[PDB]
Amino acid sequence: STGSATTTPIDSLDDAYITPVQIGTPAQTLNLDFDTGSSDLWVFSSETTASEVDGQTIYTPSKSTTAKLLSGATWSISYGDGSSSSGDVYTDTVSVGGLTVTGQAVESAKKVSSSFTEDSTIDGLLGLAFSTLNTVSPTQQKTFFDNAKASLDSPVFTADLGYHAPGTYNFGFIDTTAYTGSITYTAVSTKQGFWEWTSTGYAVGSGTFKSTSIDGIADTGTTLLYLPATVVSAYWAQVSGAKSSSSVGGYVFPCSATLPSFTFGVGSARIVIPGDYIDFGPISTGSSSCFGGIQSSAGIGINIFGDVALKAAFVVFNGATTPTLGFASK
C-alpha cells in the first residue's frame, strides 16, 4: 500500500504545516501537524476542557463506530517549546492520503496548554519519530508509520515541504518526479528516539564550505533551524545590523536586509536554503526588526533541522531495519 497527502502552511510565515487525517467511522477529518520529532498521535476532542478549545475541529469518539477505549491508558507530553497536552486513549481507524491503519492509538486530549488553544488551525499532532518516545502509559503505543510499515510497498515516508506553498507527505514510495539530481542517504542514530543524523558542514552565502560534523535531528514539527552558536554567529555576522536580542529571544535583523543563503552538508552533497527562507518577518506587527530563521541551539541541548532546513529539500525517512535519512535538492 501507499498514501499521499498534501500538507499546507498554517500561515504566511510557514510557522507549521497541517495535513488532513481521517479518523473513525464515518470519517472525522482533522488537520494534524505531522511531527518527525515526537511519537504521539493526539487530537483535540469532545473530552478536551471546553475553555481550552478555540476554533479547532474535535474528534468525538462516541460518534465513531470503530472507536474503542484503550482501558486504563493515559498520556502526557511536553514539547521543546514548553507546550504540553495530556489525556486518555482510544483505538480507531486512521487514514492518511488513502493509507489506512486499523487499531491506531488516538490520544484524546483532556488538557492542552495555551499555545495549542491559541492556534485554531492545528487540531492535533501526528508523531513520526520512533515509537520508543511514545508517552502512553502503562502500555506504550506505536506511531502511525510503525503500524503501517509492514503493509507499505517500501518502509519509508517522505517529507516535501513547500516554501510559502503546499507540499506533500508520501508513505510507502519515493516519488522520483519530486526532486532533482540524486538522493544522498546518511546514517541515523535512534538512540534518543529521533531521526538523528550528522551533517558534514555548512557554508554562508557564497562563502567557502566549512567541513565540521553537526549532529542534529530532522524535525518537521520545529519551525526554525537551530544550530551551534558558532555556526549561527558566522551566519548573522554577514547581515548588517543583525544581533542577538535577549528580550526578543534570539537573532533579529533589519527588515530592510537581503539575507544570504545557508548551505548544509549531507555527506558529499549540499542542500542550499535560500536567504528568503530565513526571514520570519517583523517581531511584532509593524516593527522594522525581523526575526531570524536560524537560531542558536545552545541551551536546547540538541541541534534541530526544522522546517527552515527541511523545506529546502526532498527528505526520505527510511524506516528499514537499519533506518537512514535521504536528502535531495528540488
Swiss-Prot record:
Active-site residues, Swiss-Prot/TrEMBL: D35, S199
Keyword terms, alphabetized: Aspartyl protease, Disulfide bond, Hydrolase, Protease, Signal, Zymogen
Enzyme Commission code(s) on record: 3.4.23.22
Family indicated by similarity: Belongs to the peptidase A1 family.
Gene Ontology molecular function: aspartic-type endopeptidase activity
Protein name in the entry: Endothiapepsin
Transmembrane feature ranges: none
Record field: catalytic activity: Hydrolysis of proteins with specificity similar to that of pepsin A, prefers hydrophobic residues at P1 and P1', but does not cleave 14-Ala-|-Leu-15 in the B chain of insulin or Z-Glu-Tyr. Clots milk
Part of the whole protein covered: 90 to 419 of 419
GO BP terms, alphabetized: proteolysis
Disulphide bonds in the chain: C255-C290
Domain of life: Eukaryota
Domain Peptidase A1 stretches: 17-328
